[PDB]
Amino acid sequence: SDRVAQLTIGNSTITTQEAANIIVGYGEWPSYCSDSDATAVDKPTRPDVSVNRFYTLDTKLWEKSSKGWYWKFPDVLTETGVFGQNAQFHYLYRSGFCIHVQCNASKFHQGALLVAVLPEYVIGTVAGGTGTEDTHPPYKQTQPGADGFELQHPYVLDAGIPISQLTVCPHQWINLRTNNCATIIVPYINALPFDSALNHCNFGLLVVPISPLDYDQGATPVIPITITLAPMCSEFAGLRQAVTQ
Amino acid sequence: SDRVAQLTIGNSTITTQEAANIIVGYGEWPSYCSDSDATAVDKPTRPDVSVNRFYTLDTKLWEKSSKGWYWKFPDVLTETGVFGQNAQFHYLYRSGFCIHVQCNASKFHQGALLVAVLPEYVIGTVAGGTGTEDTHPPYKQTQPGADGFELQHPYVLDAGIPISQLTVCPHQWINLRTNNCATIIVPYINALPFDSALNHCNFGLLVVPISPLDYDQGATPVIPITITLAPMCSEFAGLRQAVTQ
Amino acid sequence: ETILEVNNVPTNATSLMERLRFPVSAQAGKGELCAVFRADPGRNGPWQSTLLGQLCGYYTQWSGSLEVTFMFTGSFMATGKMLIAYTPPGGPLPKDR
Amino acid sequence: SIWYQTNYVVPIGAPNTAYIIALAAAQKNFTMKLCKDASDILQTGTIQ
Amino acid sequence: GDRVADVIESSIGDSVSRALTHALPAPTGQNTQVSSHRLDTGKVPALQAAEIGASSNASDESMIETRCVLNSHSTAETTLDSFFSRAGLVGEIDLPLKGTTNPNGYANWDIDITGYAQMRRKVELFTYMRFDAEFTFVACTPTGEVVPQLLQYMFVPPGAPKPDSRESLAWQTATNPSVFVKLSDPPAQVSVPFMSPASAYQWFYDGYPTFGEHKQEKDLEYGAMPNNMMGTFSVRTVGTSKSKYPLVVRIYMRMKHVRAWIPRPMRNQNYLFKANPNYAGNSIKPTGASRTAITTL
Amino acid sequence: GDRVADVIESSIGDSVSRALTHALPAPTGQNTQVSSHRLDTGKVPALQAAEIGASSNASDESMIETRCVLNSHSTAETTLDSFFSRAGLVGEIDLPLKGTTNPNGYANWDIDITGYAQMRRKVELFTYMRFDAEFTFVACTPTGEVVPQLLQYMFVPPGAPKPDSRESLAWQTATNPSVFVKLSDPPAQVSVPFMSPASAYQWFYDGYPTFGEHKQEKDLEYGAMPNNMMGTFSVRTVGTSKSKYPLVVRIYMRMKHVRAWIPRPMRNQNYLFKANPNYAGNSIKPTGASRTAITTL
Amino acid sequence: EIGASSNASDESMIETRCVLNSHSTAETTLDSFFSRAGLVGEIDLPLKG
Numbered sequence A, B: 001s002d003r004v005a006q007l008t009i010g011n012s013t014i015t016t017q018e019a020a021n022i023i024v025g026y027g028e029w030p031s032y033c034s035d036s037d038a039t040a041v042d043k044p045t046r047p048d049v050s051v052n053r054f055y056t057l058d059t060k061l062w063e064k065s066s067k068g069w070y071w072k073f074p075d076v077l078t079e080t081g082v083f084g085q086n087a088q089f090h091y092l093y094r095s096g097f098c099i100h101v102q103c104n105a106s107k108f109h110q111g112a113l114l115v116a117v118l119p120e121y122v123i124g125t126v127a128g129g130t131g132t133e134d135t136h137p138p139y140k141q142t143q144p145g146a147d148g149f150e151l152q153h154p155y156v157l158d159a160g161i162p163i164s165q166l167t168v169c170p171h172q173w174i175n176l177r178t179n180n181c182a183t184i185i186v187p188y189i190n191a192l193p194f195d196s197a198l199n200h201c202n203f204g205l206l207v208v209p210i211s212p213l214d215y216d217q218g219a220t221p222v223i224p225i226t227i228t229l230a231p232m233c234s235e236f237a238g239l240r241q242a243v244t245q
Numbered sequence C: 001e002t003i004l005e006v007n008n009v010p011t012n013a014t015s016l017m018e019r020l021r022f023p024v025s026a027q028a029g030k031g032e033l034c035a036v037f038r039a040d041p042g043r044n045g046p047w048q049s050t051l052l053g054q055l056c057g058y059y060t061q062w063s064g065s066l067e068v069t070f071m072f073t074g075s076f077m078a079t080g081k082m083l084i085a086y087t088p089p090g091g092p093l094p095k096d097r
Numbered sequence D: 001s002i003w004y005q006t007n008y009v010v011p012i013g014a015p016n017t018a019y020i021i022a023l024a025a026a027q028k029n030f031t032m033k034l035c036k037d038a039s040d041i042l043q044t045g046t047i048q
Numbered sequence E, F: 001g002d003r004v005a006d007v008i009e010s011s012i013g014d015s016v017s018r019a020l021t022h023a024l025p026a027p028t029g030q031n032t033q034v035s036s037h038r039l040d041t042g043k044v045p046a047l048q049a050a051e052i053g054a055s056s057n058a059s060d061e062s063m064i065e066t067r068c069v070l071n072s073h074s075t076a077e078t079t080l081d082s083f084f085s086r087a088g089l090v091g092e093i094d095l096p097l098k099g100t101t102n103p104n105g106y107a108n109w110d111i112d113i114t115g116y117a118q119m120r121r122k123v124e125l126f127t128y129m130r131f132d133a134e135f136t137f138v139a140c141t142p143t144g145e146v147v148p149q150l151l152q153y154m155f156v157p158p159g160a161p162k163p164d165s166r167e168s169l170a171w172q173t174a175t176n177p178s179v180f181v182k183l184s185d186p187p188a189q190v191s192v193p194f195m196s197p198a199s200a201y202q203w204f205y206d207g208y209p210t211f212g213e214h215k216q217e218k219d220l221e222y223g224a225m226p227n228n229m230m231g232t233f234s235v236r237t238v239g240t241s242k243s244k245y246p247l248v249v250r251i252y253m254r255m256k257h258v259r260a261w262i263p264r265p266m267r268n269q270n271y272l273f274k275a276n277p278n279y280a281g282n283s284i285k286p287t288g289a290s291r292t293a294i295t296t297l
Numbered sequence G: 001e002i003g004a005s006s007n008a009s010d011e012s013m014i015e016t017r018c019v020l021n022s023h024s025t026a027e028t029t030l031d032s033f034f035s036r037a038g039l040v041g042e043i044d045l046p047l048k049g
């Protein structure tokens, strides 16, 4: 009665029989932009069900040596379904998200992933190793798209900050002996009421194994982690031709 | 106060200083499908402003020997803007239309075009001339797209029916000495509450010169006819991957 | 609910019972395809095994929503997550998940 | 269409293959119209 | 719950079709009122502007000095049912003995009323039509003779098995409706309901019945409306041995409880094929009679 | 006007942010209530489920037998303003005589507080911050000496012309705000408002400032937030001839009327560059002190 | 396993609109289905047989 759950939105329904409750980031639900916070004057389009549904974008394989991955929002969806289309024809976009990371195993496997949401996840480089070179991450590393991107130095989140303190961000854990998924709901986070779904990534999703995957020889070794997400309260404005970047 | 007009819908505004009123086809305004006429159970998407706006799709040149052209709806828009996108990701579509055909000249030019709307405009062939061959029109002739298509035998509307009786269909005339545009508003016309925007063309728009273009040598000879249209009360249902045909 | 013969491939007398169930097994994690079929209830195919499809044959037209319930018969220690999708008219057989 | 969202995982000692059974029926908005004869006639010659 | 203004004042969802016109009772033709001379400026009923797309509103009273006339001429005969509820030929079926077509004692007729011009032209005046129908089957030998022969007519809806022989098991007709009648009996006659899956049959469908590439081979399907394909009508002599006489069956249809939408120009070129507006390109004739000069009769 | 049900009962447009939590007054630390032994089944405060993502709710009272303690320890010093409203170094400007940098008697400092670690690390604890600020300018010679010299400090907002010489016409300062002060005077001090076009300055912007292809050359612009670029701060000795003494100006900033959103992990690797989280990949050090064994101190 | 059919409705699996269903269920009643005459017997009375 808390281990079992069902998420239905749009024409998509998700189930789980081993849940660990739901986190509502920063203790707040996605809402539409108010007439007093708003600044742009054009009447927005709120496509509803065609874009506020569950998109299942990726699957990574968890290995005894995996480092961890991250995806950027809304970058992951800008080229998918009706949502991607609206994000392209419009300058302005705002929305919330319901994230559902899935990973099941067996009662004989073990391991724990940390699933967190980090607003304004700015990536850094190793500065030529020595730290004397002012290098910067390439577009494909900052907006990895749907395939996400593997962390090079998980301990400092590839940004000079301790992953040990990452729990200060909305999160959940997928500890195999306990659950098989994390569900986090995120409201719009920005200093503006609207923004470009192309130039700016409001937050990054991180999935990092903190307690390594393990099992005896003979148990299924292919342990996938799948990413499913649904935009919520999607609003768009500033219409023109489609643009991909 | 009837010669002058302004049409604003979406983020598009059209003006004319030489209008001849507005026709509302079959004396009825575009409305959304009611809960009692509806049959499909999924909650539809009504994108509003992103698709119910004015698209300006084509320009043809009127010549002293032009025969006339026709365009199929919603065929003309299936690959344009946010509307085209919704028409592709969804199985079901319904909408109305506001058509604005434009053509200006000078007080020294003369000629009159008939602008009409013909529901279920099925095209026929000349059956090998003799009438012994059961030929059929190719996809490019039945759904000419945005470029429209030039009538081969305007007198019988390429379908064995008298163009002289075409006025029984919602219409207007662009008689240069009088006006410079036709505006016709069309409600959804079908025997079903929804349908495929791809497989079925609810109606065809015809623009045919009945009184030939004429002017003395020296007056501007390039007389364009431009087509602008706006979907109204657009509704979509039956979502899946995008499909072009 | 009556049994839908999704696995309508075996035809030799001794294997007919196999059409009553289809399998699943450990995979390679590429979101592989497990099975497919047309939702058309009064059409030739899997639905002919169901009483619904049968009664359906005595009527020319029909209207309504349908439901298919899948029961997993693996051991209690087996886990898994599957994605089952209905693709409305117009959309061709999904090339990938 | 049915796809593997993750994978069929099992520990040591359990079968690597299992079956699914599908049951189908109609919802309550379901109705039929125009009574006709079925496409099959389960008879070859005369039934004696 | 809604809160932002644009959402509250939105008209998205209005399912009522605002109608600019409404029907009025008109049992008789209109009367003529007395009128006298008018010598005014500003008032100009005679002048119109056809570009607008409406018909002239000028009445007799305003163009000449009229007397009063009480018009009691009925308008009853021009109602859809008056016009359509008259049986006409729609199908002809031949059951010859020694022949090239049906020498096997039975026949299947795909229900299509576009095979005959008189009837076809009338219905095609409208785009959509909804109605019930009364079918009458007139059978006799090719000379118009009556013989002591027994027939079976069976309605085969789409999906039901089609008889392939005079002895098909399909003739058991356990669920389909069949009519057994003799040529000596008066013609068989039945009522049929409105059977389309659509709200109305449509004489014109500008589209394709399926998705996909619409290549040359599949161009024969342009305009194919399954919603109009009601099924087959099969007839057979009732026996194992062949019938001694050649037969012909004429099918007459009388529409009743009719409703029509979207009037269109009436066909003006000879018909060539069923469900398909093809016309002979080389014999495109003007709609009517012609003359030598516009200034002469 | 709306009519179809789904539209009426739609929640599209709800602009109120349903909030699951709310702030409560907490002027002092919490008190400890008396507790006694508990020997129960079903009641298990000690056991938690961290996977959920929430912190343990187990209190002292439920894990051991506690006495009563009236806690009056104030929580006032840990408020944003208490923590941030303390002036710290954010900028250093050199005005040498014979030098490689500013031998021309003036200097332009692009306002960026990320040049100094102490201050930088504090602010970067949050993602968004809104506040007013008090700036204090401490000037002296490189030995910490005071000389009878007159300076001019001018705030040059983005778009205003930047002085390019100690004699630039820009120094007329007809519209920009300038401060004229002597080294002999106490340090100059002013208040500055919240000037971003955004509702808050943001120490981290995960994006690009412009549209287009983001090729190698334009990768230096990843994370560039114009909303944080408040302008330039220019200083000059006030004269036509060069100043007799070399100078240094230290800029101190004290935040006030502070508001912050979205706390984040605190920097644990040495800083290398302004506005850019780059860290030395070869010298990645653990956050803290380390030991030889987990079973020993 | 219980032996009952699924109680899950459309409304609970996807976001549905409202639809007023007036589709009749009259044709599927026992008499509608069975009260249609069909062949059940054939009897031959030949001469020389």
Ligand SMILES: CCCCCCCCCCCCC/C=C\[C@H](O)[C@H](N)CO
Pocket: E111, E112, E113, E114, E133, E135, E153, E154, E155, E177, E178, E179, E190, E192, E195, E201, E203, E228, E229, E230, E233, E275
């Ligand atoms: C005892 C069996 C009697 C036979 C019953 C025949 C019922 C036929 C229903 C009338 C359908 C109206 C005609 C519909 C479509 C047109 O003929 C063409 N298909 C148009 O292409």
Ligand SMILES: CCCCCCCCCCCCC/C=C\[C@H](O)[C@H](N)CO
Pocket: F111, F112, F113, F114, F133, F135, F153, F154, F155, F177, F178, F179, F190, F192, F195, F201, F203, F228, F229, F230, F233, F275
């Ligand atoms: C008389 C002139 C006095 C100078 C006035 C200086 C006003 C500066 C406003 C404070 C702005 C806060 C700092 C903002 C952003 C950070 O320093 C970096 N740009 C972040 O990348």
